């Protein structure tokens, strides 16, 4: 069981064109309720979404907190911004997802043997910092630009035991499946 399942649901990444993106859920939001089901951990949200979809629920409420940053003068005593949303429940029977990801650091857990990854020398245990110049804070951010770049080189920045190293890769299609891939195992 992954570590994030016991952590509070703090959105680390929102998938484009997803239910969460269309409704306006943003990184930094904390999901605290959905119909009902209290949401304290990522495990609660996963179990609630499964039970809701199996019960045929197509729409329900989603309670969300939006906090963070330095308070503006005079507003430090304000109550927490709690948002009441009406959400579309994803159809888990058809594999649909809500579209949010946890804040798991993009640390590579393994590299496939022979795949153009050890080509430029990315090893297991590396930490991805920036790609294509843009800073990123989660793994799913990298997978988005891989299947959108369309083959062109993606410049990556990597930290290893203190040193910061720059690697560049270019590979693309695959015969068995048919999509752009690199060859990395998350941890």
């Amino acid at each position, epitope marked *: 069981v992954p570590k994030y399942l016991k952590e509070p649901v703090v959105v680390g990444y929102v998938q484009r064109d997803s239910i969460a993106q269309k409704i*306006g859920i943003k990184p930094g939001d904390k999901i605290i309720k959905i119909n009902g089901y209290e949401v304290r951990t990522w495990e609660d949200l996963r179990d609630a979404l499964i039970r809701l979809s199996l019960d045929g629920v197509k729409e329900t409420t989603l309670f969300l907190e*939006r906090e*963070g940053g*330095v308070a503006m*003068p*005079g*507003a*430090e*005593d*304000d109550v927490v911004e709690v948002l009441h949303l009406t959400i579309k429940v994803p159809n888990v029977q058809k594999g649909e997802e809500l579209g949010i990801a946890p804040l798991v650091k993009p640390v590579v857990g393994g590299v496939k043997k022979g795949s153009p990854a050890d080509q430029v020398g990315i090893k297991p245990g590396d930490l991805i910092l920036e790609v294509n110049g843009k800073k990123i804070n989660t793994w799913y951010e990298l997978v988005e630009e891989v299947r959108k770049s369309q083959g062109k080189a993606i410049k990556l920045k990597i930290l290893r035991n203190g040193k910061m190293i720059e690697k560049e890769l270019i590979p693309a299609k695959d015969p068995k499946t048919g999509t752009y891939f690199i060859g990395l195992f998350p941890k």
Partner: antibody
Amino acid sequence: SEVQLVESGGGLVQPGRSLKLSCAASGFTFSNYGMAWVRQTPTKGLEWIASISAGGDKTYYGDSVKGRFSISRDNAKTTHYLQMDSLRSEDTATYYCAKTSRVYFDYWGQGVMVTVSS
Amino acid sequence: QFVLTQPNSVSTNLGSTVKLSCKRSTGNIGSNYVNWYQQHEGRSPTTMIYRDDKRPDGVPDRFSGSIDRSSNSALLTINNVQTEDEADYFCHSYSSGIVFGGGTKLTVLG
């Protein structure tokens, strides 16, 4: 949204005299949010004047205010106030009351005109 | 303690994409949230963007906020600029006090 902010108490005042603005709030729990006053002129634009905390215990003021204005609030009558003393002709502006949401003003009033002239 | 500098006026055409800039004089722009307000003629300001890039309910998807710590500037981007977007836009931030930008009068031609 159900938040409503309605200013009153504006108008004309001779220079050096006093004027107290009111902002009646409804549609939300008044004591749960800090209030503020922002004024506007066609020349100076938007300029923050005063800010008071949700409970009414801390006050903050802009640079153009030097002990002249006193922002208060009545959490029982869902109304906050801006007492203005020693008004100069340069204080002529449209005065908005505003509600805060931690890091910004989420809703503004309708604005009331205050003209300082003899 | 610091000021926010916006262009006095910006002219764009219908259906185009406009970038309203808000520059922080001193300090890091990421250290405090940047908020954007729209004010039509003779009307009260309404929130377009809060917390750097959050868009309230009812605001069209055409509006979007961003932060560029390289130039220490905040940018309000309006895709497919319509005629109703012709208004004043004020950026807003804070620290020990509360600071408003000078405002940009957006003119929509075409």
